[PDB]
From a paper:
pmcMenin, a 67 kDa protein encoded by the [name] (Multiple Endocrine Neoplasia 1) gene, is a chromatin adaptor protein that interacts with MLL1 (Mixed Lineage Leukemia 1, also known as KMT2A) to regulate the expression of multiple genes, including HOXA cluster genes. [name] has been identified as an essential oncogenic co-factor of MLL1 fusion proteins found in acute leukemia patients. MBM1 binds to the central cavity of [name], utilizing Phe9, Pro10, and Pro13 as energetic hotspots, which occupy well-defined hydrophobic pockets, and positively charged arginine residues (Arg8 and Arg12) that are involved in electrostatic interactions with the negatively charged binding site on [name]. Importantly, recent clinical studies found emerging resistance to Revumenib treatment and patient relapse as a result of somatic mutations in [name], leading to point mutations of T349M, [name]/V, and G331R/D. Understanding how these mutations affect [name] structure as well as the interaction with MLL1 and current [name] inhibitors will be crucial in the development of a new generation of inhibitors maintaining their activity against [name] mutants.
We also solved the crystal structures of these [name] mutants, showing no structural changes in the MLL1 binding site on [name]. We found that point mutations in [name] do not change the protein structure and only minimally perturb [name] residues surrounding the MBM1 binding site. In contrast to the predictions from computational studies, the crystal structures of the [name] mutants revealed that these point mutations have no impact on [name] structure or stability. Recent studies found that one of the most frequent mutations, [name], impairs the activity of Revumenib through a direct steric clash between I327 and the inhibitor. Interestingly, the [name] mutation has no effect on the affinity of MLL1 binding. However, activity against [name] mutants is significantly reduced, from 5-fold for G331R to over 100-fold for [name]. Biochemical studies have shown that the activity of Revumenib and other advanced [name] inhibitors are strongly impaired by these mutations, with over 1 to 2 orders of magnitude loss in potency. Such an effect is observed for even the least perturbing mutations, such as [name] and T349M. Our structural analysis clearly shows that all these point mutations exhibit a steric clash with the [name] inhibitor Revumenib, overlapping with inhibitor fragments that extend beyond the Pro13 binding pocket on [name].
Numbering used by the authors: 2 to 53, 74 to 386, 399 to 461, 548 to 588
Write the structure that this text describes.
C-alpha cells in the first residue's frame, strides 16, 4: 500500500513537482521504486509517446497513479506466494528471485520489438505489457521491494543488468535476457562470465546498486526522444534536474555513466552555477578509477565524444587511447559485440572523418594542428596497441583486413617528419611503449615517408602470405 505521507504532494502539476516527489522519496528510509517508476513512465508517455492535448505538463493525479500502483502490487502479491520461500536471516533465496523473474517475464506480450523506446518503466509494463531487457531487471527489483525483500538489488555492467541478493548481498542471479539470439541464463550466477574476463561482466567490477542508485538508474533511463529529429525539452529538463538532485545527495558518486549523462545534458543546456561538462566527464572517470578498478570503458567514450563534437582532435585521440588502455586487459568474448562495434566505429569512421577535416585545415594553414603534433600520433598508435592487446588471448579475434585500409590511411595523415619524432621504447621527446606484439612488429613501418600498405596489412591481420600469381 502507498502510505499517507507518499500521497501529500499529488497532484504533480510540473517538472518541479516531480522533483519534489523524488526529493521526498530520497529522504525516506527506502525510496519507493514502484511509485517513482510509474510516475516517470506516466510523464514520459504523455511528453514523448503521445503529446495530443498537451498544454504544459501532464498532470499526474493521485487516483491515476495509485490505480497503476495497485495493478502492479496486486499482480506481484497474487503471483508470488512468499510462504513457499521462507527467508532465513532477512535474506532471499535463489528460488524466490527466480520466481519473481518468471512472474515478470510471463506477463510480457508474446511478440514485440524489444529495442523500442519508452518500454523501460513500470508504466510500460502495466499499460503495454512490454519491457526492454534492463527494464525487466529493474521490474524484478521493484517487485522484490514491494514484497519486503530488502536484500535484492540491481547489478549493472555497461551492457547488461541482473540482481544481487542473499547473505551479505554476495549472490548473483540472471533475471533478464542479453542481446538478441544469445542463450538465456536466467537463474544462474554471473561467475562464468566474470571468470572469462569478458567486457560484459567487467571482470567483476560491475555496479552493485543500493536503493538510491536504483533511483539514479531509472532517472538515467528516462528517454526524451519523441522521434529521430526531436527530443522533449520537458523530459530533458526533468532528467537534468533529477540528476542534479541525486548528485547533490551523493548518489552518483559510484555511478560513472550517470555523471556522463549529466555532462551531456549540461553541454546541451548549461545550468548556471554548475560544473562544466568537462569537469563532469572527469568526475565520471574518477568514479570508475576509485570504485571500479578503472575497468569501465564508457567514462572515456563519453569524454571522447565531447571532444569529437568540439572537433578537438588532440583531446579526442587522447581519450580514445585511454579507452583502448582499459580494453587491453579484457578477453573479447561472444556477447561483447556492442563494444566491438564502438571500437570499430571509432577506428573506421570517426577518426578518419576527424583526420580528413584536420588535413584540409592544415592545407589552409592551421597552427597547432593535431597532425603536426607527435603526441597525437602517439595517441593514435596507443589506441591501436590497446585493441591489438585486447585481441591477445581472446577466444574470438578482433582485427581483420577491413580495419587495415583505415589504419594505413590514418597513419598517412601524419607526415613522416612528425611520425619520426615518436620514440617507441621497449620494456625493458615523445615516447611510447607498446603492450601488443602486433604493434611491436609494426614499429619499423611507422616512420617511412611513404607507409608500406601491404606490410602493414600483413602485420595487423597476421595474414601470412601474399597473392600467388
Amino acid at each position: 500500500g502507498l502510505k499517507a505521507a507518499q500521497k501529500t504532494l499529488f497532484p504533480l502539476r510540473s517538472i518541479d513537482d516531480v522533483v519534489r516527489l523524488f526529493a521526498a522519496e530520497l529522504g525516506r528510509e527506502e525510496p519507493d521504486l514502484v511509485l517513482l517508476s510509474l510516475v516517470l513512465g506516466f510523464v514520459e508517455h504523455f511528453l514523448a509517446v503521445n503529446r495530443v492535448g498537451l498544454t504544459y505538463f501532464p498532470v499526474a493525479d493521485l487516483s491515476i497513479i495509485a490505480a497503476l500502483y495497485a495493478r502492479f502490487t496486486a499482480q506481484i502479491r497474487g503471483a508470488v506466494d512468499l510462504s513457499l520461500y521462507p527467508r532465513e536471516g532477512g535474506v532471499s533465496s535463489r528460488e524466490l528471485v527466480k520466481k519473481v523473474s518468471d512472474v515478470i517475464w510471463n506477463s510480457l506480450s508474446r511478440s514485440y520489438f524489444k529495442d523500442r523506446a519508452h518500454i523501460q518503466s513500470l508504466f510500460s509494463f502495466i499499460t503495454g505489457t512490454k519491457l526492454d531487457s534492463s527494464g525487466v531487471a529493474f521490474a524484478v527489483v521493484g517487485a522484490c521491494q514491494a514484497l519486503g525483500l530488502r536484500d535484492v538489488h540491481l547489478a549493472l555492467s555497461e551492457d547488461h543488468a541482473w540482481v544481487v541478493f542473499g547473505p551479505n548481498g554476495e549472490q548473483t542471479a540472471e533475471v533478464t535476457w542479453h542481446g538478441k539470439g544469445n542463450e538465456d541464463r536466467r537463474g544462474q550466477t554471473v561467475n562464468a562470465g566474470v571468470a572469462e574476463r569478458s567486457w560484459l561482466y567487467l571482470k567483476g567490477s560491475y555496479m552493485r546498486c543500493d536503493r538510491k542508485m536504483e533511483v539514479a538508474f531509472m532517472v538515467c533511463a528516462i528517454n526524451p526522444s519523441i522521434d529521430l529529429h526531436t527530443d522533449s525539452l520537458e523530459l530533458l529538463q526533468l532528467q537534468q534536474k533529477l540528476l542534479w538532485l541525486l548528485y547533490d545527495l551523493g548518489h552518483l558518486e559510484r555511478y560513472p555513466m550517470a555523471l556522463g549523462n549529466l555532462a551531456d545534458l549540461e553541454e546541451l543546456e548549461p545550468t548556471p552555477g554548475r560544473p562544466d561538462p568537462l569537469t563532469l566527464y572527469h568526475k565520471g572517470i574518477a568514479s570508475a578509477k576509485t570504485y571500479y578498478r578503472d575497468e569501465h570503458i564508457y567514462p572515456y567514450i563519453y569524454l571522447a565524444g565531447y571532444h569529437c563534437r568540439n572537433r578537438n582532435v588532440r583531446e579526442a585521440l587522447q581519450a580514445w587511447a585511454d579507452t583502448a588502455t582499459v580494453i587491453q586487459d579484457y578477453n573479447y568474448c561472444r556477447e561483447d559485440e556492442e563494444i566491438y562495434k564502438e571500437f570499430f566505429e571509432v577506428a573506421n569512421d570517426v577518426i578518419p572523418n576527424l583526420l580528413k577535416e584536420a588535413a584540409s585545415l592544415l592545407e589552409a594553414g592551421s597552427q597547432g594542428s593535431a597532425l603536426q603534433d607527435p603526441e597525437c600520433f602517439a595517441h593514435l598508435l596507443r589506441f591501436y596497441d590497446g585493441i591489438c592487446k585486447w585481441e591477445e588471448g581472446s577466444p574470438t579475434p578482433v582485427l581483420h583486413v577491413g580495419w587495415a585500409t583505415f589504419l594505413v590511411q590514418s597513419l598517412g595523415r601524419f607526415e613522416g617528419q612528425v611520425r619520426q619524432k615518436v620514440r617507441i621504447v621497449s620494456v625493458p621527446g615523445p615516447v611510447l611503449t607498446f603492450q601488443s606484439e602486433k604493434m611491436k612488429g609494426m614499429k619499423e613501418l611507422l616512420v617511412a615517408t611513404k607507409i608500406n600498405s601491404s606490410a602493414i596489412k600483413l602485420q595487423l591481420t597476421a595474414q601470412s602470405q601474399v597473392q600467388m600469381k
